[PDB]
Design a protein around this nucleic acid. Structure first.
Lengths: 210, 132, 210, 128, 135
RNA sequence: CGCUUCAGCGUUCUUCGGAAUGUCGCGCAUUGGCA
RNA sequence: ACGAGAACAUGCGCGACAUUCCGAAGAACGCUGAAGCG
């Protein structure tokens, strides 16, 4: 049983909005905030969001069975990688994607420019019959910000590690060619992955090739 | 408030309603607030308040930073400017005492009192929109 | 499952004003600023603004049902290409139009000619009876500025790609004639779209004919 | 507390008032009130409810009283923006009950008001 | 921002003080004829404001806090224009001498900082606003 | 030989849905029972 | 010289598995830098 740790950075190419509720604001002020780490008050990328987007893109790429209704019906590779809960076929999740935190280098870089990590984008909706604008203010993480991720891969079967990491590479390529968070169809959340180190923290598995 | 009245959200409601006048014209009511104050001017004042409120809310310390204090000084100058340009705005400022409140928040120099004033302004604009 | 990437350039024939609130204005100064990328403090064209203008133009072109209250009520081609949120008919947006940032080539060209990125224009409105004028100053993006976009197209249905790209080109032709951002009745927002390359970044689809 | 014509405000009255307003057309509540505006008001009362829930003292603190005052302000603002929200607020007497909760100044009365609001939302969902 | 003569503070409050000190009723023909700075009209104030506004927006588009040499030369020409306008009209001269504006722009050049220039523009804007309010 | 007025205004300030679901809900050993 | 005397209701057992707070949405609508001419 081995544990390989993937560590790198998520660079915000286009302003990133991951919605987090529970905020009351003044009339006319920010309407939709972003998810933030309460202790630091700095924007965060939840591991739930990364895992969900990667799993959804990978399942789309491998294929969706006609009339699929649940996530446990995904392809066997996806169930092997991200986990499963099917009755009688519970498969453990080899990928444990963690919350991506605001990088300290990016924080110091923004403090260099006297720039706020979050920008308030001003948008509106033009009605189709009245043509009257409806204004909204969406918080986004400023472009040029980096989040350092942390992923753990559990080597349960030695044979399938190469195929699993090939699927992880495909999923990360899809996510780079896709968006993260909300509003991405309208130009939000475009990211880039910069992998820093893939190493076997636990066990004697050989992660040099990966 | 003058006459021993206390600034409050109910104070905002009573200020808006007592200045409210039906002023029926051609059988059709035309509600006027503070001698014909339009809601666009209030929204501009509320936009100033929104910017200062965002600046102070993104801050951490209860004591206002000099950047917020500078915005409050600018807000008083903006209130004076708008008072002069439109008589309705001057009437609104003198009734609400919002300019006096900006001096009061500066003396308090704390985020809680600012937030209260922000809520007072919100009450002013909300009741103006409701009574319209 | 294929992702196609379209990258090109948006060049402003006339000054462009896409606004962004939250900025206090000194008396006699820019009352309505343009939307700018906080990092570089450079003008930017929002992905949402391009998508909304394109979708609106395409919807008017195809046609609108009488009393069309909602955007979810649209032509099937618009609903498929730009997405939907109809209850029970939640479609997916095959367009991922993104923020068009200020090009580095045009930025260096402006720095050569000692040109500010944004021009300031003096306007006023004169009463047709009292002949009393109220003046204003508007901020607009200097003509000849360039913005490079990045549109991702998802191949949800392989058979429909030709029709969807025909609709995309129709929307581009409409938006190039129409203005973008500030009113074009006043002549603000004239723009030009020049595509650089079309290529399927992910998958096996053939985009050469596109 | 109590409404006009001496009726009693309770979860039974929440069901009753959601039913009397309920008009068949689609099921229309309070002349066009949508689930989204109701959930926005529920978000406001949920923020105040979390504030009070975390607390243990029965007496309502100053901050939650100011929260209730701002709740009344938001009620007025939403009534001004939308006719249906105004109709809902006047038929269910939610702002009046906010005044009553402020008068009583105890955790029990605020929790009962939260239960009444939640019952209004629940029966609105049920009767649609 | 800066300090004027006798160590007096230059603030927006002091802008109100300056505008009210030169504010007198001087009613004529039974009608109030508000006089600011001995006949200074709003048009001259707004012209001076616009002179400020040009370099204001030029600095606002800039990112670096240090005033570029372009801003330095713009402020030198601003001093030239203020002197010329003061010479042209006695009211403008009275306004300039009472408001210490040229001293303020010299201090702005001395500091060579964006913040000081902004504060100076805000003080000029305050003066204009107060004048509009009291008129 | 310029001068004066005007410096922004009126108007939208979010909307519409989803508000958790599915799975397990004690098992075993001793007691019991049967041999 | 108490139906009594000892005698642990105990041992092993992760509240856990699957879940993108998303979907749809142009900060735009109207607006001659202009009027008088001393």
């Amino acid at each position: 049983y081995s544990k390989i740790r993937i560590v790198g950075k998520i660079d915000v190419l286009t302003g990133l909005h991951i919605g987090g509720g529970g905020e009351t604001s003044m009339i006319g002020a920010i309407a939709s905030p972003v998810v933030r780490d309460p202790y630091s008050r700095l924007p965060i990328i939840p591991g739930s969001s990364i895992k969900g987007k990667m799993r959804s893109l990978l399942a789309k790429h491998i294929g969706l069975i006609p009339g699929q209704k649940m996530h446990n019906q995904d392809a066997p590779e996806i169930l092997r990688l991200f986990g499963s809960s099917q009755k009688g076929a519970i498969q453990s999740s080899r990928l444990q994607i963690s919350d991506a935190f605001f990088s300290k280098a990016s924080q110091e870089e923004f403090d260099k420019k006297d720039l706020a990590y979050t920008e308030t984008k001003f948008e509106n909706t033009i009605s189709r019959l009245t043509a009257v604008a409806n204004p909204r203010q969406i918080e986004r993480v400023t472009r040029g910000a980096s989040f350092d991720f942390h992923i753990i891969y559990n080597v349960e079967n030695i044979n399938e590690v190469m195929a699993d990491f090939e699927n992880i590479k495909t999923a990360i390529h899809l996510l780079e060619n896709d968006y993260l968070g909300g509003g991405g169809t309208r130009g939000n959340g475009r990211i880039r992955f910069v992998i820093d180190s893939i190493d076997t923290v636990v066990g004697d598995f050989d992660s040099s090739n990966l | 408030t003058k006459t021993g009245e206390m600034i409050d959200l109910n104070f905002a409601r009573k200020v808006v309603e007592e200045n409210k006048r039906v002023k029926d014209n051609r059988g059709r009511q035309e509600i006027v607030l503070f001698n014909g104050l339009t809601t666009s001017k209030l929204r501009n004042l509320l936009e100033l308040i929104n910017h200062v409120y965002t600046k102070v809310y993104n801050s951490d310390d209860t004591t206002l930073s000099e950047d917020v204090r500078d915005e409050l000084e600018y807000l008083k100058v903006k209130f004076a400017y708008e008072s002069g340009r439109e008589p309705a705005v001057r009437t609104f400022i003198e009734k609400t005492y919002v300019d006096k409140l900006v001096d009061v928040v500066l003396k308090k120099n704390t985020k809680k009192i600012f937030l209260d004033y922000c809520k007072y302004f919100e009450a002013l604009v909300a009741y103006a929109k409701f009574y319209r």
